[PDB]
Amino acid sequence: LYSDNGVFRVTSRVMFQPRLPVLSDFVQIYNCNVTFVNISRVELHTVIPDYVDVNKTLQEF
Amino acid sequence: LYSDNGVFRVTSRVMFQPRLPVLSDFVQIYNCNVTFVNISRVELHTVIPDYVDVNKTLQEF
Ligand SMILES: *[C@@H]1O[C@H](CO)[C@@H](O[C@@H]2O[C@H](CO)[C@@H](O[C@@H]3O[C@H](CO)[C@@H](O)[C@H](O)[C@@H]3O)[C@H](O)[C@H]2NC(C)=O)[C@H](O)[C@H]1NC(C)=O
Ligand SMILES: *[C@@H]1O[C@H](CO)[C@@H](O[C@@H]2O[C@H](CO)[C@@H](O[C@@H]3O[C@H](CO)[C@@H](O)[C@H](O)[C@@H]3O)[C@H](O)[C@H]2NC(C)=O)[C@H](O)[C@H]1NC(C)=O
Ligand SMILES: *[C@@H]1O[C@H](CO)[C@@H](O)[C@H](O)[C@H]1NC(C)=O
Ligand SMILES: *[C@@H]1O[C@H](CO)[C@@H](O)[C@H](O)[C@H]1NC(C)=O
């Protein structure tokens, strides 16, 4: 996972083939080592396209 | 997939590294051999966190 100046993309480690990140690539490993990317839940969709928080949207809608 | 007395977790088979189950680990293989876990669709979220049934929630909301 890397950063092309405000745009996050995912590529391999052997060849350079960029694409966009999707939800099926992430797991959940509780408690957050320090050297991660600080981001709140509201702006998470700017990292992962095609991720809609059902909870907060049904709070709104 | 195992059970720590009402809490379901997923670990490897070589080392013991527990975490929570997510949606990207399951496939759909129709007709249900006998020795599974009997559970209805309403309480499925107690097995899989971050699984919202869109259909029944839009029936409600
Ligand atoms: C994401 O945000 C968190 C919190 O806003 C950052 O965690 C904290 O970061 C500081 C420095 O990056 C860690 O060092 C501390 O610095 C102070 C001096 O201001 C010093 O007095 C402390 O003894 C300590 O050395 C701090 O430990 C850390 N907080 C915790 C609870 O570990 C985090 O660094 C941010 N992410 C990135 C990539 O910067
Ligand atoms: C999940 O629930 C289903 C249905 O509620 C269970 O399926 C049925 O389980 C019984 C015993 O576990 C199976 O054996 C049957 O027992 C009766 C005696 O009560 C006997 O007369 C029958 O000939 C048969 O041996 C039954 O076959 C099975 N139903 C079907 C359609 O196969 C299931 O066992 C439950 N899951 C677990 C893990 O227990
Ligand atoms: C999920 O969403 C519903 C309604 O949007 C809300 O009542 C519930 O508290 C939310 N749960 C979490 C863990 O965000
Ligand atoms: C999916 O949800 C919609 C509205 O919530 C409903 O009309 C439809 O029957 C549902 N389909 C299934 C297969 O549950």
Asked if B21 contacts B1 with a C-beta cutoff of 8 angstroms, the reply is yes
Chain B residue closest in CA terms to A59: B61
The experimental resolution of this structure, in angstroms, equals: 3.4
Structure-determination technique: cryo-EM
Nearest ligand 1 atom, CA A37: 38
H helix runs in B1-61, sequence order: 54-60
Which uninterrupted H or E stretch holds A22? none
Q: Retrieve residue B1's tokens.
A: 């997939």
Residue nearest ligand 2's atom 30 by CA: B34
β-partners of residue B3 are B8
Whether B34 is in the pocket of ligand 2, judged by its Cβ within 6 Å, is yes
DSSP state of A13: S
The residue type found at B42 is V
Contact A47, A39 (CB under 8 A): yes
Task: For chain B, count helices (H), then strands (E).
Answer: 1, 2
User: CB-hemisphere CA count at 13 Å for B38?
Assistant: 2
Give distance in angstroms: CA of B36 to centre of ligand 3.
Answer: 29
- Helices (DSSP H) in A1-61: which residue ranges? 54-60
Burial of B13 (0-12, 13-18, 19+ CB in 10 A): exposed
Which tokens belong to B44?
């499925």
